[PDB]
Amino acid sequence: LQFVSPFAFEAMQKVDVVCLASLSDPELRLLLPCLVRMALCAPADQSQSWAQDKKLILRLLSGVEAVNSIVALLSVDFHALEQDASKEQQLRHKLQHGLTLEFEHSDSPRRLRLVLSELLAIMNKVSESNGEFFFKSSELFESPVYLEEAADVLCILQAELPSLLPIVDVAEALLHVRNGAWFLCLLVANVPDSFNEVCRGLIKNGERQDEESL
Amino acid sequence: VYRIARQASRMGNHDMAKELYQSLLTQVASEHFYFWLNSLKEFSHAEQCLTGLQEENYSSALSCIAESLKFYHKGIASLTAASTPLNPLSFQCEFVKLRIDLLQAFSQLICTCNSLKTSPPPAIATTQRCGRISNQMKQSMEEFRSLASRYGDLYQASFDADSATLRNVELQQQSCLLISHAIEALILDPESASFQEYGSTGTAHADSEYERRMMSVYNHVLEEVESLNRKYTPVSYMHTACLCNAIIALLKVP
Amino acid sequence: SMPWLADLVQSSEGSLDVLPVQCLCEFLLHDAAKKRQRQQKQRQLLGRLQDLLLGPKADEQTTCEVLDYFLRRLGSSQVASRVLAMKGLSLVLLQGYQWLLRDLPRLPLFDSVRSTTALALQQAIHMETDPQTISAYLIYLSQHTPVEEQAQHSDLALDVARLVVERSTIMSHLFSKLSPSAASDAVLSALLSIFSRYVRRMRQQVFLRWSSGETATMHILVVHAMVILLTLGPPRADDSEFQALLDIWFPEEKPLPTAFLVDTSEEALLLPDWLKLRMIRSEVLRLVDAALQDLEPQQLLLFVQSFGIPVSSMSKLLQFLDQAVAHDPQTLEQNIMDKNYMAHLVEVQHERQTFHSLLTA
């Protein structure tokens, strides 16, 4: 399990293209989905400098064919997804194939559906447990062969749905799931303004005196 | 040499303060005096790191801010170790803690200004605030206003200081109000500002050079805020550049 | 069927053996003062099973029952069931998979149960998720598939085709360009040999006809799998089979074998848009030249918008787009929805002309 290099997270902090250019291929592949949202989206910034800066960002974007895959991840109508997630939210407040089997033999939208539904399950199980570090054996996160596109789609829903996926809640929720400190690593890597408030949130909503607990 | 070092720390020449604090650190024959001198050394180190800035360069801003925070945190650990029941150093610890919080408000603000270049315009759903940057600068309101309140609380709880120390605390609180007003005039509701600084911006007493440079920075930031009032889009990049230049201008005056 | 077995076996001390052999293997899979006695009984059961499989008392019925039970326990959807079947098969009999490669062919009754194991591993290829397990399964299939049966060999080819097509992530991990392993090279050579021996058998659903007159009623997914294996390049170990398939399906200065429909008797597109995109992604010049022909301007814009393509492919796509501009500029201009975006995209394709001149105007 390969964690992102500190130099890469600084380069995300620094918002500079020259340090991103001198970065190795698996590091670029791991840092990808934020960068392709920086590439194929409407310009948030209108400066003349961000013109060639964005040009150089899309200049280094070639290689790794899976880019096109997550381009499909930014190819769905998202309004139906958010109404479906909201309807599931009020449903919770009141599958012949396996998880890996449905996760592979699928297209983008129902992959989005299953991942948002199980994030809803982990979140309302946090709301139900109230303090106890509960165990969930969600198969698609244990899943040693299928992890990197799972981090990709987690980044995609994190950067799509601002209010229905709040940052600290999804952060502690994937703290409760299986081996996903690297998932939190990706989630704070893709959006640079996450590290200090995720530190705040993890400091409050945990145990106080004994670090020897599970 | 201790008097010279503290005079240099008073005026703002923190490099000679570093060197004389090293000299004191090798010296001296007690526990908490040693920890006190180590804390002062670390503060001088972070302040030299803050003097090493360059205008219109945000990369050096993040780097030197991170160096200043780590040296201040070694210093505040030393100050906490230096505290004694007989002499419960309370002004020093609170002043250093709020200085750390001010520089981290600046760090979150500068990387939040970087977030517009590090995120989408909003999402595909959004097509009058759109994007996570609006929520982030609302959090900046909460942090900066709370920090100004904490500066006021440090002012009210001392009563034993002189005019100069109180005026310096007023300078830090006015910096917090300056950044808060600058942000809530550019991005968060431009509509109900309608002021354009209808008070006096000149003819000051100027009891110290640091006061004068603080007031010049304040007037320049307010001039930039008045000029860039209601011409441009609510998110903008002249707004983020205005915040960046404001943070650089505050951190240039040591 | 794990938890009720776990709380029933542990609560039944007097029935650890049970006279049927299937229950003996069930308790062995469950097992995989009191702990020492349990370990001694497990060792005695392992010795009894080794006598029942490798000893002089090894008959066909008990061996078939034991291995069929192990293979049908391998087919359970839970990965822990396959892990337990792994542990049992390794305890009774790629260093960790050497029992399937070396210990299993040493069985005295290897033929019929080997065919049964080949069928069961073909069924497991539908479901297996571990890439190295799939690699070992493919190696064992390439070494021990019954070639004589046509239906079994066609089912093997279809299962490998489905494995390549619908589970392309597994082979993408197995063909990671950062770390090309010798085991992956052997697996690629084995799959190429499987396809080559299928073709050598057959040449001596879609109707495919060659330029040499040979005819076929095959599946198009098999064609997709073998052309993706063609895009994987020549293996380091063997090169004659890869060049043979490359010469047969993409011959030099000769037309390609055309496709046809079995049911309604119509010509079918053997190379779809995503497949042709992957052809352009490949480093083999013949495949890219074959994919160059019959490309629409909308397909040209779709292919250029993709990323991960080699440099000479963007170059030749740029001259083909210039040729499309010189042929029909108005339709391609009408297909343009944002002139700045594609003008910039062509500018990117430059340093990695006529089309750019059309976009700037």
Curated annotation (Swiss-Prot), chain A:
Signal peptide start and end residues: none
Compartments it resides in:
Nucleus; Nucleus membrane; Cytoplasm
The source's domain of life comes to: Eukaryota
The UniProt family comment states: Belongs to the Integrator subunit 2 family.
- Its quaternary structure? Component of the Integrator complex, composed of core subunits INTS1, INTS2, INTS3, INTS4, INTS5, INTS6, INTS7, INTS8, INTS9/RC74, INTS10, INTS11/CPSF3L, INTS12, INTS13, INTS14 and INTS15. The core complex associates with protein phosphatase 2A subunits PPP2CA and PPP2R1A, to form the Integrator-PP2A (INTAC) complex.
Described function: Component of the integrator complex, a multiprotein complex that terminates RNA polymerase II (Pol II) transcription in the promoter-proximal region of genes.
Listed name of the protein: Integrator complex subunit 2
Origin species, per record, is Homo sapiens
Q: Which residues of the full protein are shown?
A: 15 to 241 of 1204
Swiss-Prot record, chain B:
Provide a GO CC annotation, any one: chromosome
**Key words, A-Z:** Chromosome, Cytoplasm, DNA damage, Nucleus, Phosphoprotein
Enumerate the subcellular locations listed in this protein's record, separating them with semicolons. Answer: Nucleus; Chromosome; Cytoplasm
Per the annotation, which location comes first and is thus the protein's main one? Answer: nucleus
**One annotated GO biological process:** snRNA processing
Biological role:
Component of the integrator complex, a multiprotein complex that terminates RNA polymerase II (Pol II) transcription in the promoter-proximal region of genes.
The annotated subunit structure for this chain is: Component of the Integrator complex, composed of core subunits INTS1, INTS2, INTS3, INTS4, INTS5, INTS6, INTS7, INTS8, INTS9/RC74, INTS10, INTS11/CPSF3L, INTS12, INTS13, INTS14 and INTS15. The core complex associates with protein phosphatase 2A subunits PPP2CA and PPP2R1A, to form the Integrator-PP2A (INTAC) complex. Interacts with NABP2.
Family as reported in the entry's similarity comment:
Belongs to the Integrator subunit 7 family.
Q: What is this protein called?
A: Integrator complex subunit 7
**Gene designation:** INTS7
Residue range from the parent sequence: 526 to 788 of 962
UniProtKB/Swiss-Prot annotation, chain C:
Annotated compartments: Nucleus; Nucleus membrane
Transmembrane stretches in the record are 215-235
Q: Which domain of life is it from?
A: Eukaryota
Function in brief: Component of the integrator complex, a multiprotein complex that terminates RNA polymerase II (Pol II) transcription in the promoter-proximal region of genes.
| Protein family (similarity comment) | Belongs to the Integrator subunit 1 family.
Give the disease entry from the UniProt record.
Neurodevelopmental disorder with cataracts, poor growth, and dysmorphic facies: An autosomal recessive neurodevelopmental disorder characterized by severe global developmental delay with motor impairment, cognitive delays, absent or severely limited speech, dysmorphic features, hypotonia and cataracts.
Q: Could you describe the subunit structure of this protein? A: Component of the Integrator complex, composed of core subunits INTS1, INTS2, INTS3, INTS4, INTS5, INTS6, INTS7, INTS8, INTS9/RC74, INTS10, INTS11/CPSF3L, INTS12, INTS13, INTS14 and INTS15. The core complex associates with protein phosphatase 2A subunits PPP2CA and PPP2R1A, to form the Integrator-PP2A (INTAC) complex. Interacts with ESRRB, ESRRB is not a core component of the Integrator complex and this association is a bridge for the interaction with the multiprotein complex Integrator; attracts the transcriptional machinery.
Protein name, as recorded: Integrator complex subunit 1
Organism in which the protein naturally occurs? Homo sapiens
The gene that this protein is the product of is INTS1
